[PDB]
Paper text:
[name] ([name]) catalyzes the transfer of a methyl group from methyltetrahydrofolate to L-homocysteine (Hcy) without using an intermediate methyl carrier. Crystallographic analyses of [name] from [name] reveal an unusual dual-barrel structure in which the active site lies between the tops of the two (βα)8 barrels. The fold of the N-terminal barrel confirms that it has evolved from the C-terminal polypeptide by gene duplication; comparisons of the barrels provide an intriguing example of homologous domain evolution in which binding sites are obliterated. The C-terminal barrel incorporates the zinc ion that binds and activates Hcy.
To determine how [name] has assembled an active site for catalysis of direct methyl transfer from CH3-H4folate to Hcy, we have solved the crystal structure of [name] [name] at 2.0 Å resolution, along with structures of the binary substrate complexes with Hcy and folate. Comparison of the substrate-free structure with the Hcy binary complex shows how the DMV region moves toward the zinc center when Hcy binds. In the absence of substrates, Trp539 can adopt another conformation that would overlap the binding site for the pterin ring.
Residue numbers in the entry: 0 to 733
Write the structure that this text describes.
Amino acid sequence: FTKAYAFGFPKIGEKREFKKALEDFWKGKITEEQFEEEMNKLRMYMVENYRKNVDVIPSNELSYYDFVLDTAVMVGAVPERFGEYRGLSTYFDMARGGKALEMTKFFNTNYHYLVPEIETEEFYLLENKPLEDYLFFKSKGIETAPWVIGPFTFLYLSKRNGEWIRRPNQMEKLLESLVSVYKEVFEKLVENGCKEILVNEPAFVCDLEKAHWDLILNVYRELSEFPLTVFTYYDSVSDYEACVSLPVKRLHFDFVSNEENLKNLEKHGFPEDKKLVAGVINGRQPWKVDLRKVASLVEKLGASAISNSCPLFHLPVTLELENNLPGGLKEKLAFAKEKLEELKMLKDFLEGKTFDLPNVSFEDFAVDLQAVERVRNLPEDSFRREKEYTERDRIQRERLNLPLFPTTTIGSFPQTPEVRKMRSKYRKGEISKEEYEAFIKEQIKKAIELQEEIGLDVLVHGEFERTDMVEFFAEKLNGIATTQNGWVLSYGSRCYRPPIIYGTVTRPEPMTLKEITYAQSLTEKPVKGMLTGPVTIMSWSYYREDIPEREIAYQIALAINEEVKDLEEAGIKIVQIDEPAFREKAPIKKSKWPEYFEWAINAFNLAANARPETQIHAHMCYSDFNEIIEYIHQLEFDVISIEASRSKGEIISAFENFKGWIKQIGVGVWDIHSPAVPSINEMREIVERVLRVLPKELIWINPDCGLKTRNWDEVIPSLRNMVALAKEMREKFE
Ligand SMILES: OC[C@@H](O)[C@@H](O)CO
């Protein structure tokens, strides 16, 4: 007998019933009772999928917005600004709106959770959702195992007075209080017949201190009387011996995202007093795997149970209807539903109920050797630009002829309903390619003339022809496919369809030349080429695992550099490369950052390997650069734009303290997440702060980030104020 587990199955539904329910309810289209009924249908669909494939059925997974927020509500962590917790009304206020909790990435994934704000030192059982869901399924004659976020990870993902609660001394006191509530929840479950509880502790894979583990041991000793099964994923646990010594009867390890868990288990063994649950089916990638190979790992480990490595919600629901993928790709893929079926196959095989498993091997599939070696024989010169910054700077400035404190923007422009409809009609084939392009040309012209009128120094074409930055390029690159319904939850009701890098990546034709060249033909002002970095493209896409990550990254980077070269040839003087994944794609373990940044840096530089006369702008809307400034410094950009409104310019500290910093900085002086129009005085405070140490010639003035989420009536007046401010600064520091 091989007990099979599974967790994190997508909640959105095959027809995206979840997204529609949430949105209809918010718009007032349906009632709370109707919203609930729809959610229960999804609940049944989920456990139905589980029941057909695995032995242990999870419950408490259908979150109405975020499971971390659900955990906070469970323990009473509701900020005072929300008043008494009413229910859904309060829940969504904490989730979205002007008073909502901060939203941030869940570990190193594309799912975003809500950051609990701990205002009190005493937790209490506000709502027992785990019990609620457990009883709901029991009433349907279905035994389930509540899926909950463990107490250590919960605090680890939370903040107290604006700071993370991550040091042992910051966690210790709160934990005793927190575990007491968990104890109450667990006791009630057991009293009601609950046989197993799935506790998620992914924080165990962070670079923890031995002091953290001392705290964790004490936490679980207090919960040793409950039927707990602890899961860890996204990487190897930070202290194997300490982890396996925890007083829990069942322990799960992710044997997919890392090799350390296995090596450590082979070297130190695994306790006889507890059972191992082998996470052997990947939840982060959509590739079919040779179940005979997986089977051998499980057999060597003598593991009594199996399951996916990490939550399945990082994958789309089903591959079933994906019948328009490039030839041969569909047969090598497997989404959430198929991953569950793989666990069933593995279970049956391991129990001798079957003696055969489908063969899986496609190493040569979609592999373009000529392009591969083009990257494998990479000579240093493709990673370092011809001349050093100081020399390039001299050449660029004489070429650009820009004033002190030049102004520009750094992203998309707002998209009217008309722009959206045209893109729609185009995708549906309602209109021709020539027709769509003509429309785009019109929007670009209007945008260019508007910037001219407003008085900006460096212009952008608006990107009215793009929706998702990564999808835009994925559709133009060979080796990358896009799905029709491969939806994956990002947060709340927001879903995205990750592209699939299934083979060697190359750029067959120019991807952005027509729009950029056209925009530039309308003005004497320099117009920016706008591209997305290599690491960002793969960060938002699924990709082959039988090739090192850095190779895929360099392949993409080379393709991007070809675009850069075509832009240069076309006379484009400035090229911006947005690489938000530079930090966002970094390992959860900062101890693994050296190896990661080595190639992330090389990938960007390969993509940005432009002629000395070509000004390269790197763009990243990070809230702080203190922990990565040393890596940033190795990127061969000429200008780097940052968001400085939130910190009122204090984010500049990482730059003024970097000895030898001499590159230009595009200072964001306007928060594009607010409809409010920044006053000239507000922006002035920011620029003045930035000018405290750094020389004035390094500074550019621009908005914080893209503008596509704002309306024109907000953008125009803010842009004019930005120009007015820059003009003022020039007179002052003339
Ligand atoms: O160390 C992991 C931390 O930086 C966050 O990604 C957790 O969500």
